[PDB]
Amino acid sequence: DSITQKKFLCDRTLWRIPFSSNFMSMGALTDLGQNLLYANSAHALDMTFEVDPMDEPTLLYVLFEVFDVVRVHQPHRGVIETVYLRTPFSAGNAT
Amino acid sequence: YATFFPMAHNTASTLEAMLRNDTNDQSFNDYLSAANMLYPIPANATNVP
Amino acid sequence: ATPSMMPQWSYMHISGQDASEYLSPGLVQFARATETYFSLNNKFRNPT
């Protein structure tokens, strides 16, 4: 008399969750990212992960997918100027 | 080490003159384009908020 | 989408006009005429 066990293996990949309304990929800038409710205010975020036990210290590695761009401009001979921007989190300094 | 295309002087000067206007700038973006965080999971734990 | 960061977006070519429009006519004609051996396509955004 026997019992059954099932499992799956999936390496060389990262788990993805998109911030889109229908989960599809309709462009670089998802429609929810432009929604007024998430754009003209502030909100707090809470996440809860449940994993399986292991017998050594480990790390949970999270990637917030954002926009990161740089613009480079050089008016006169021997001059380089740049402007960096990361939209959801930070951009240089102020004042 | 570096390598230059041996482009003609008239064409190179014209391209240089055109690529200095305040509207023909250049742009780039990191392919991954994300911000990273690392949180510790102590041994034998199972819940991470 | 915020007029509070609308020029902030459109400046870095994150949204709005596309590459084949905000470039000078001379540069566009040049880049189209010298495509085969000295490319210039991967240095501009034209967002989506």
What descriptive keywords fit this protein?
part of a larger assembly, 95 residues, 2 helices, mainly beta, 3 chains, two-stranded antiparallel sheet
Describe the protein's architecture and organization.
The structure is cut from a larger assembly and holds three copies of chain A. The first copy, chain A, is mainly β and 95 residues long. Helices cover 8% and strands 23% of the residues of chain A. Chain A contains two helices and four strands, in the order H-H-E-E-E-E. Chain A has a two-stranded antiparallel ribbon with strand order 3-4. In chain A, a hairpin with a 7-residue loop joins strand 3 (68-73) and strand 4 (81-86). The longest helix of chain A has 4 residues, at 31-34. Chain A is elongated and about 85 Å long. The relative contact order of chain A is 0.11. Chain B binds chain C through residues 5, 7, 14-15, 18-19, 21, 23-24, 26-29, and chain C through 12-13, 22-24, 26-27, 30, 38, 43-45. Strand 2 of chain A pairs antiparallel with strand 2 (34-41) of chain B, so a sheet runs across the interface.
